[PDB]
Write a protein that binds this ligand. Structure first.
Ligand SMILES: *[C@@H]1O[C@H](CO)[C@@H](O[C@@H]2O[C@H](CO)[C@@H](O[C@@H]3O[C@H](CO)[C@@H](O)[C@H](O[C@H]4O[C@H](CO)[C@@H](O)[C@H](O)[C@@H]4O[C@H]4O[C@H](CO)[C@@H](O)[C@H](O)[C@@H]4O)[C@@H]3O)[C@H](O)[C@H]2NC(C)=O)[C@H](O)[C@H]1NC(C)=O
Ligand SMILES: *[C@@H]1O[C@H](CO)[C@@H](O[C@@H]2O[C@H](CO)[C@@H](O[C@@H]3O[C@H](CO)[C@@H](O)[C@H](O)[C@@H]3O)[C@H](O)[C@H]2NC(C)=O)[C@H](O)[C@H]1NC(C)=O
Ligand SMILES: CCCCCCCCCCCCO[C@@H]1O[C@H](CO)[C@@H](O[C@H]2O[C@H](CO)[C@@H](O)[C@H](O)[C@H]2O)[C@H](O)[C@H]1O
Ligand SMILES: CCCCCCCCCCCCO[C@@H]1O[C@H](CO)[C@@H](O[C@H]2O[C@H](CO)[C@@H](O)[C@H](O)[C@H]2O)[C@H](O)[C@H]1O
Ligand SMILES: CCCCCCCCCCCCO[C@@H]1O[C@H](CO)[C@@H](O[C@H]2O[C@H](CO)[C@@H](O)[C@H](O)[C@H]2O)[C@H](O)[C@H]1O
Ligand SMILES: *[C@@H]1O[C@H](CO)[C@@H](O[C@@H]2O[C@H](CO)[C@@H](O)[C@H](O)[C@H]2NC(C)=O)[C@H](O)[C@H]1NC(C)=O
Ligand SMILES: *[C@@H]1O[C@H](CO)[C@@H](O[C@@H]2O[C@H](CO)[C@@H](O)[C@H](O)[C@H]2NC(C)=O)[C@H](O)[C@H]1NC(C)=O
Ligand SMILES: *[C@@H]1O[C@H](CO)[C@@H](O[C@@H]2O[C@H](CO)[C@@H](O)[C@H](O)[C@H]2NC(C)=O)[C@H](O)[C@H]1NC(C)=O
Ligand SMILES: *[C@@H]1O[C@H](CO)[C@@H](O[C@@H]2O[C@H](CO)[C@@H](O)[C@H](O)[C@H]2NC(C)=O)[C@H](O)[C@H]1NC(C)=O
Ligand SMILES: *[C@@H]1O[C@H](CO)[C@@H](O[C@@H]2O[C@H](CO)[C@@H](O)[C@H](O)[C@H]2NC(C)=O)[C@H](O)[C@H]1NC(C)=O
Ligand SMILES: *[C@@H]1O[C@H](CO)[C@@H](O[C@@H]2O[C@H](CO)[C@@H](O)[C@H](O)[C@H]2NC(C)=O)[C@H](O)[C@H]1NC(C)=O
Ligand SMILES: *[C@@H]1O[C@H](CO)[C@@H](O[C@@H]2O[C@H](CO)[C@@H](O)[C@H](O)[C@H]2NC(C)=O)[C@H](O)[C@H]1NC(C)=O
Ligand SMILES: *[C@@H]1O[C@H](CO)[C@@H](O[C@@H]2O[C@H](CO)[C@@H](O)[C@H](O)[C@H]2NC(C)=O)[C@H](O)[C@H]1NC(C)=O
Ligand SMILES: *[C@@H]1O[C@H](CO)[C@@H](O)[C@H](O)[C@H]1NC(C)=O
Ligand SMILES: *[C@@H]1O[C@H](CO)[C@@H](O)[C@H](O)[C@H]1NC(C)=O
Ligand SMILES: *[C@@H]1O[C@H](CO)[C@@H](O)[C@H](O)[C@H]1NC(C)=O
Ligand SMILES: *[C@@H]1O[C@H](CO)[C@@H](O)[C@H](O)[C@H]1NC(C)=O
Ligand SMILES: *[C@@H]1O[C@H](CO)[C@@H](O)[C@H](O)[C@H]1NC(C)=O
Ligand SMILES: *[C@@H]1O[C@H](CO)[C@@H](O)[C@H](O)[C@H]1NC(C)=O
Ligand SMILES: *[C@@H]1O[C@H](CO)[C@@H](O)[C@H](O)[C@H]1NC(C)=O
Ligand SMILES: *[C@@H]1O[C@H](CO)[C@@H](O)[C@H](O)[C@H]1NC(C)=O
Ligand SMILES: *[C@@H]1O[C@H](CO)[C@@H](O)[C@H](O)[C@H]1NC(C)=O
Ligand SMILES: *[C@@H]1O[C@H](CO)[C@@H](O)[C@H](O)[C@H]1NC(C)=O
Ligand SMILES: *[C@@H]1O[C@H](CO)[C@@H](O)[C@H](O)[C@H]1NC(C)=O
Ligand SMILES: *[C@@H]1O[C@H](CO)[C@@H](O)[C@H](O)[C@H]1NC(C)=O
Lengths: 97, 384, 137, 137, 137
């Protein structure tokens, strides 16, 4: 896994990517398969997660094949494995705080 | 006694193909209304005498989630909207600066016309006539047509409006009913009427006009959920079925949305999805006798666009009466799954991907081409 | 006839029929055919669309009838060649294929070999032409 | 040409000509052909009707050209078979028929036998195919 | 294909290509084809004009395919005859003609002889038919 370490109170950008640049559906889930963020059409949605008031995404980059998850105000409780689902492929990044 | 190669021409074999479809519609072209104006120079008159041929004993694999007819409808509708419901300010990213267009916002009449998609010469459309077709299995009753049924391009989220109903039962279709990352399309076999309005009696607030409501028959809505629940129960037999409000995100997803004229009606659907179902019967919709579930709606001027990333501003609301009368014909649901779902499943309104809205109507159709040249072994030999 | 299969170039039979049954049905229909035994704009528009489909099918038909001469099968609906079946392409017997399979199933059974077979057919025709011209001297 | 007889599929000659005369005229015209030596709605409507008639005649022509393969006569305007005339069908000589009768009169002379003859033609073709495949071994 | 030459009946190749090059290109394209690998009144008017052009080309094509039977070349794009070249009509060799000339140049080279050649082709076919029927006795 890619491993990214942040610190309590910081902001971390975790990313998923694609070879195709535009009109790509993606989702971010945690290790317990709970949705955090995702792309429906052109809209950003949130899942039933502990991160709904902290997680965000830079919508302008979605058409660049870059689908970031940004967690603002990190806590130790956020350390986890974050799973990207983009198109058909999956990616995993571990976040430590 | 040897097997020899034989070439045959006129072999009744077809393959999947992608071509550009044309369209037809019953446009009047003099009503000034956007769809009639667009259709005037986009679509032809419909076929005065359409025909359908049933193919006996033909099994065909259909897949509604890989259907390219969707992409064409998606692109035609985007053009229809961009050529009509023009925002005053259109702001989009460019990668990442912003590109801004300032232009007039005339108000226009805006009501959908069912559009029929038709195969060009050399192509044909196969239609799956099974009443239980789930969107990805084989279809054992297949007929050939040139044109699809007409589909009204209604653009909405959470609840699908107008379009069409299932023949017998509510059918729940999902590419993968268990991955928690697909929109579940629920097609109803009965419509539920929703009546939305702003009845010409509004004021303005400052320091309202942007206030409207929608009435949903209570009895039909609760009966509808009971039938949906019965099908969900079959899929998830040991779990509680919970209908909840949306999870968060852009307003177009969180609330319902639709467009009448230039009025975008963002409506709070919490009153429709706030209940826990035990087998197929529950409470949480008390029998008070009102028989009307009402939604609170707002008209917004700055909205997120569905056709791409960006925001757009539209001119303020019409001062008279706005009336919309729609048929809820299906739902777009997503699941709340996870490792800790200890005996329950939660369903929430979703949508926002306009392709899902179009798949819900185009799922029965496939475009094919004919490849008449085939080879089979024979017992004859060529004289040489 | 020509409407078999519910489409032009579906000439040899109904989709869903077995290959064998379709051939027999075609023969019977051929014998019968030779024995010989409300106005609106949309009518104009669709009349043109229908003609375009019919004209195109005819043009494609005629083109293919001449293109097939490359394998020595020009001007034919049913040809016959001198290329052996080679067994590995399909392990089924003549009766198994013709009696139980339809045409689509058959094409699925061997579509990993048709580009190979087409090449073999061309090679055989070239050799046949060469041999005939050598004999004519 | 193709307009002979004042209709499509009247190819072999003028109605009213004798069978013999029509054949000779056809040959002459064929040599010449190869040597090579105001706007109203009704124009749209009739343009479509005219095309439908022409497209249909072509489709029928092509269909029949392939159907006739059942007697070994595919792809032909004039065929030749190995079925004897059998005398009783018509007691006239070759010159009497070809020199004095037209085509309609001829068909009237023998229309009590054409279903019989068609059957005989099919049988001969089947036997010919069988014999050829038996020889090729 | 059929669009070669930028016109229907330009089937054998691009104008401007040499005769030889066109033949080779035709073979390659034939292999590929068999391997298989906004509304206004004027749309009605021109749709009809386009169909008339296409229908006419088909009718002419089919007619000529049958007319050529007079030389023993019916049903063919490329024929082969038994009439000697006779030298005087053209003093060029097979390679000189096919490698360096285009089709228009070639026709210009021999258009003082084509009526003569057409006559010779007819005569040969008549003799061939006569000989075959004499043998069949
Ligand atoms: C599902 O299908 C149904 C029907 O099959 C769709 O329902 C239709 O929705 C349209 C949208 O409003 C509605 O159209 C109105 O009908 C009224 C009947 O007379 C018209 O008067 C009204 O026209 C006025 O309002 C328009 C708003 O944009 C103006 O553009 C237009 O110029 C008119 O405006 C004048 O009058 C108003 C009056 O208050 C005034 O304020 C203005 O200033 C101006 O003076 C519309 O035509 C249809 O009647 C509905 N059909 C039915 C049967 O009710 C439904 O929308 C589909 N669902 C979805 C989601 O699309
Ligand atoms: C649930 O909501 C619906 C709205 O969709 C209510 O129906 C409406 O009830 C009002 C009651 O007055 C009806 O008004 C009547 O209109 C006619 C029109 O000519 C008028 O003549 C009558 O005097 C009266 O004003 C209204 O028409 C009716 N809407 C429809 C479409 O019929 C319904 O009553 C609500 N349910 C309950 C239990 O309140
Ligand atoms: C109005 C539209 C009508 C449709 C027109 C269709 C035109 C398409 C032409 C495709 C030609 C394919 O390519 C060519 O075909 C001819 C067909 O006899 C082959 O020709 C072969 O048969 C002929 C006659 O049996 C022989 O004289 C020749 O020696 C032999 O090789 C060529 O070897 C091949 O290179
Ligand atoms: C766009 C429309 C174009 C018109 C399409 C017309 C299609 C109509 C097809 C009719 C088929 C009639 O029925 C079938 O014909 C073929 C014609 O060769 C016959 O086939 C016969 O000739 C071929 C070639 O000479 C041999 O390979 C075969 O062994 C022999 O039996 C079949 O024995 C007969 O059963
Ligand atoms: C819908 C429109 C379709 C297009 C219709 C075109 C019809 C044009 C017909 C032109 C006929 C030309 O003239 C005639 O052609 C036939 C073609 O086999 C020749 O016939 C020759 O071939 C046939 C078959 O190979 C033999 O049976 C015959 O013994 C032999 O002479 C005639 O000797 C000639 O006189
Ligand atoms: C396959 O689907 C077709 C289309 O619905 C069914 O045929 C229809 O049956 C109804 C019964 O009243 C008729 O009114 C329609 O006109 C029929 N349509 C056509 C195109 O024929 C057909 O029965 C189905 N077959 C099976 C086995 O279910
Ligand atoms: C639609 O129904 C078909 C069956 O008719 C489902 O396909 C089956 O899925 C199971 C899952 O393990 C396989 O074992 C079967 O072999 C499949 N059958 C066939 C014929 O493919 C299909 O998945 C259903 N699709 C949806 C969208 O629910
Ligand atoms: C439908 O989604 C489920 C859930 O993602 C897929 O099943 C998973 O497949 C991965 C592959 O390694 C396994 O590790 C998971 O444990 C599986 N999950 C479960 C719950 O079994 C399933 O394969 C998908 N089905 C299709 C047809 O794609
Ligand atoms: C939508 O439903 C509401 C009730 O849920 C309707 O409002 C009621 O209308 C009746 C009719 O006389 C009044 O007596 C009630 O007092 C109203 N209720 C309230 C809370 O004011 C409303 O009119 C319906 N909408 C439409 C368009 O009819
Ligand atoms: C939305 O308005 C429609 C009419 O435009 C309502 O349908 C009518 O309901 C009354 C109630 O008794 C019936 O008598 C009428 O016959 C119905 N009309 C039609 C055409 O069926 C509809 O019920 C309204 N929706 C809601 C939720 O009240
Ligand atoms: C609808 O979803 C919300 C969001 O998850 C549920 O609210 C949560 O309920 C649990 C139960 O203990 C609380 O701990 C969470 O704090 C609640 N979330 C929030 C944001 O308050 C809600 O209960 C669901 N509704 C139904 C009917 O189950
Ligand atoms: C939809 O309406 C409901 C009211 O029925 C809103 O829920 C309320 O939100 C406020 C916000 O603080 C809470 O204090 C209330 O207790 C909530 N009410 C209930 C019954 O839970 C809901 O947020 C609205 N949703 C949207 C998307 O507008
Ligand atoms: C779910 O939303 C519905 C929307 O109707 C709520 O129903 C209303 O509940 C209040 C509670 O006092 C009643 O007074 C209303 O009359 C009810 N509406 C109708 C049309 O009868 C329902 O209670 C909500 N459920 C939960 C569990 O909160
Ligand atoms: C129905 O309620 C009973 C009460 O104990 C519970 O055990 C059961 O699981 C519930 N079933 C569903 C589907 O909610
Ligand atoms: C649906 O309405 C009927 C009407 O009697 C009621 O009994 C039933 O409990 C309702 N369903 C729910 C979920 O309240
Ligand atoms: C809702 O469905 C009924 C079923 O017949 C139909 O008559 C009605 O017009 C539909 N309403 C809309 C708005 O399309
Ligand atoms: C389909 O199966 C039935 C079973 O008797 C048969 O009669 C019918 O002809 C079949 N259709 C085709 C296309 O073979
Ligand atoms: C086809 O026959 C040849 C004959 O030697 C053989 O080598 C070849 O492998 C066969 N094709 C296949 C796919 O086995
Ligand atoms: C081919 O058919 C024979 C018949 O006995 C069988 O033994 C053989 O295994 C078959 N080959 C394959 C690949 O199934
Ligand atoms: C009709 O008879 C006259 C008599 O000379 C003849 O010249 C003419 O060609 C005949 N017409 C036909 C169709 O034979
Ligand atoms: C045809 O010739 C056969 C030869 O034996 C004969 O039996 C038959 O009766 C003849 N046909 C007629 C109508 O006489
Ligand atoms: C057939 O022609 C011959 C020729 O002499 C004649 O004698 C005989 O009677 C004719 N048959 C009939 C039935 O007229
Ligand atoms: C024209 O000449 C150029 C020179 O290279 C050649 O490539 C091209 O194919 C020629 N065009 C034709 C029609 O032969
Ligand atoms: C063609 O060959 C013959 C053979 O004798 C010859 O007489 C004739 O003159 C040749 N043609 C020309 C134009 O020389
Ligand atoms: C024909 O080609 C030969 C080749 O040597 C040449 O000698 C002769 O003069 C040529 N004839 C003419 C008329 O040019």
């Amino acid at each position: 896994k890619k491993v990214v370490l942040g610190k309590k109170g910081d902001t971390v950008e975790l990313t998923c990517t694609a070879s195709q640049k535009k009109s790509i559906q993606f989702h971010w889930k945690n290790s317990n398969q709970i949705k955090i963020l995702g792309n429906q059409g052109s809209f950003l949605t949130k899942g039933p997660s502990k991160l709904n008031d902290r997680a965000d995404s830079r919508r302008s980059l979605w058409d660049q094949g870059n689908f970031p998850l940004i967690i603002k105000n990190l806590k130790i409780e956020d350390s986890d494995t974050y799973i990207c689902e983009v198109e058909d492929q999956k990616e995993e990044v571990q976040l430590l705080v | 006694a040897k097997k020899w190669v034989t070439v045959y021409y006129g072999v009744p074999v077809w393959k999947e193909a992608t071509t550009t479809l044309f369209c037809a519609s019953d446009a009047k072209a003099y009503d000034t209304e956007v769809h009639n104006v667009w259709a005037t120079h986009a679509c032809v008159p419909t076929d005065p005498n359409p025909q359908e041929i049933v193919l006996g004993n033909v099994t065909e694999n259909f897949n509604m989630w890989k259907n390219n007819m969707v992409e064409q409808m998606h692109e035609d509708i985007i053009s229809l909207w961009d050529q009509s419901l023009k925002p005053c300010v259109k702001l989009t990213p460019l990668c990442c600066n912003t590109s801004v267009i300032t232009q007039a916002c005339p108000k226009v009449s805006f009501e959908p016309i069912p559009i029929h998609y038709c195969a060009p010469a050399g192509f044909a459309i196969l239609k799956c006539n099974s009443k239980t077709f789930n969107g990805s299995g084989p279809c054992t009753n297949v007929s050939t047509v040139q044109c699809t049924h007409g589909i009204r391009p209604v653009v909405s989220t959470q609840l699908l409006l107008n379009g069409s109903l299932a023949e017998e039962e509510i059918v729940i279709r999902s590419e993968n009913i268990t991955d928690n990352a697909k929109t579940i399309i629920v097609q109803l076999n009965e419509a539920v009427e929703i009546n939305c309005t702003r009845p010409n009696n509004n004021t303005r607030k400052s320091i309202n006009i942007r206030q409207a409501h929608c009435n949903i028959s209570k009895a039909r809505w609760n009966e509808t959920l009971g039938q949906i629940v019965a099908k969900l129960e079959e899929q998830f037999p040991n779990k509680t079925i919970i209908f909840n409000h949306s999870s968060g995100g852009d307003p177009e997803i969180v609330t319902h949305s639709f467009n009448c004229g230039g009025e975008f009606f963002y409506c709070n659907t919490t009153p429709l999805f706030n209940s826990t179902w035990n087998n197929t019967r529950t409470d949480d919709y008390p029998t008070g006798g009102e028989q009307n579930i009402t939604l609170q709606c707002r008209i917004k001027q700055i909205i997120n666009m569905w056709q791409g990333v960006g925001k757009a501003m539209y001119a303020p609301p019409i001062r008279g009466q706005i009336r919309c009368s729609s048929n809820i014909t299906g739902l777009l649901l997503t699941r709340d799954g996870g490792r800790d779902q200890n005996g329950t499943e939660t369903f929430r309104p979703g949508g926002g991907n306009m392709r899902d809205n179009w798949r819900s109507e185009l799922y029965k159709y496939k475009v094919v081409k004919i490849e008449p040249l085939g080879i089979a072994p024979t017992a004859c030999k060529r004289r040489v | 006839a020509v409407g078999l299969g519910a489409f032009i170039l579906g000439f040899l039979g109904a989709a869903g029929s077995t290959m064998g049954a379709a051939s027999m049905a075609l023969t019977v229909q051929a014998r019968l055919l030779l024995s010989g035994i409300q106005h609106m704009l949309q009518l104009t528009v669709w009349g043109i669309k229908q003609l375009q489909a019919r004209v195109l099918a005819v043009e494609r038909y005629l083109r293919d009838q001449q293109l097939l001469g490359i394998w020595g099968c020009s001007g034919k609906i049913i040809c016959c060649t001198n290329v052996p079946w080679n067994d590995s392409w399909s392990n089924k017997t003549i009766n198994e294929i013709w009696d139980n399979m339809t045409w689509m199933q058959w094409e699925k059974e061997i579509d990993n070999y048709t580009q190979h077979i087409y090449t073999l057919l061309e090679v055989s025709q070239i050799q046949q032409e060469k041999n005939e011209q050598e004999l004519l001297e």
